[PDB]
Amino acid sequence: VPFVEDWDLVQTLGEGAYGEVQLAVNRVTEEAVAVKIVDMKRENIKKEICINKMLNHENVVKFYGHRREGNIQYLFLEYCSGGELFDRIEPDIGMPEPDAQRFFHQLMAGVVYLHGIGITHRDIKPENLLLDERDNLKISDFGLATVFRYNNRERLLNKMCGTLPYVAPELLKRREFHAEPVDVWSCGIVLTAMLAGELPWDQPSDSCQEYSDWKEKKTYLNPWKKIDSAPLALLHKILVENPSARITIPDIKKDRWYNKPLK
Numbered sequence: 533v534p535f536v537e538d539w540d541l542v543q544t545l546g547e548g549a550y551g552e553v554q555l556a557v558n559r560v561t562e563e564a565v566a567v568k569i570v571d572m573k574r575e576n577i578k579k580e581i582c583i584n585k586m587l588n589h590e591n592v593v594k595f596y597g598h599r600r601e602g603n604i605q606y607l608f609l610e611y612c613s614g615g616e617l618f619d620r621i622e623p624d625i626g627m628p629e630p631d632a633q634r635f636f637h638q639l640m641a642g643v644v645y646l647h648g649i650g651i652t653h654r655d656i657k658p659e660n661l662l663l664d665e666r667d668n669l670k671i672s673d674f675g676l677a678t679v680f681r682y683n684n685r686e687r688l689l690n691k692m693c694g695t696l697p698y699v700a701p702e703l704l705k706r707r708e709f710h711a712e713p714v715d716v717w718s719c720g721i722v723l724t725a726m727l728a729g730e731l732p733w734d735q736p737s738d739s740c741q742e743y744s745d746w747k748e749k750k751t752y753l754n755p756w757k758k759i760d761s762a763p764l765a766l767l768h769k770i771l772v773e774n775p776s777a778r779i780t781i782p783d784i785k786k787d788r789w790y791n792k793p794l795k
């Protein structure tokens with residue numbers, strides 16, 4: 533309560549499942565901080581805090597701290613004044629290829645970082661990728677994040693949490709699966725949306741005709757026909773159904789378009 537004495541909760545920045553994100557500005561210094569408010573009596577809030585404590589990287593939203601007031605949790609986060617990546621994507625169009633390439637490089641740096649410390653995000657999508665005042669990408673919203681590697685010993689995951697058009701096909705087919713290829717797949721869906729302004733399917737299942745179309749290499753249909761051959765060839769390696777055959781991030785960093793000078 534003494535916080536709201538000195539800090540103005542200026543307005544709502546977004547709505548999550550358990551509550552809102554508010555912009556807080558200090559009436560004296562004018563410093564701005566984002567306040568995620570979560571109702572424990574309604575994403576896993578205990579783990580979110582716990583995972584946020586581990587993170588220190590230029591492409592992850594910085595966590596300052598938290599507190600509990602009754603049943604309500606408050607997370608204090610760096611304010612990313614550039615907003616969601618989602619709002620840089622023009623519906624049915626996307627954004628310029630150089631912008632998409634730069635964002636994707638920054639997505640990869642943030643994802644390499646998380647996986648390096650054995651964390652998987654599990655909900656990668658444009659709504660969970662924020663931009664700072666220099667348009668640097670910041671991975672956000674760790675409510676579905678979990679540890680997949682303990683020191684140097686991996687475990688397989690089994691939770692089908694995640695936003696369905698971004699979910700890898702193994703989540704609908706296998707009872708357990710490796711963490712890292714799931715994150716690589718959602719990144720591919722993000723790249724597709726950036727380049728075309730359009731998600732390719734509701735869900736990566738056999739019954740979905742748009743998924744069948746992609747499996748059958750019908751790249752003359754939307755969204756694929758709007759995408760240049762070079763970035764498309766990377767997408768061909770990422771949106772690979774068998775997660776064991778799917779491109780890894782060290783191999784993404786060798787891809788021709790990935791390394792292509794544009795503009």
Ligand SMILES: NC(=O)Nc1sc(-c2ccccc2)cc1C(=O)N[C@H]1CCCNC1
Pocket residue numbers: 545546547548553566593609610611612613614615616659660661662672673
């Ligand atoms: N740390 C932050 O600054 N968070 C921000 S800034 C912002 C913002 C900043 C400038 C303009 C518009 C929005 C939106 C969000 C935010 O967290 N929104 C969530 C909502 C649920 C889906 N994930 C994103």
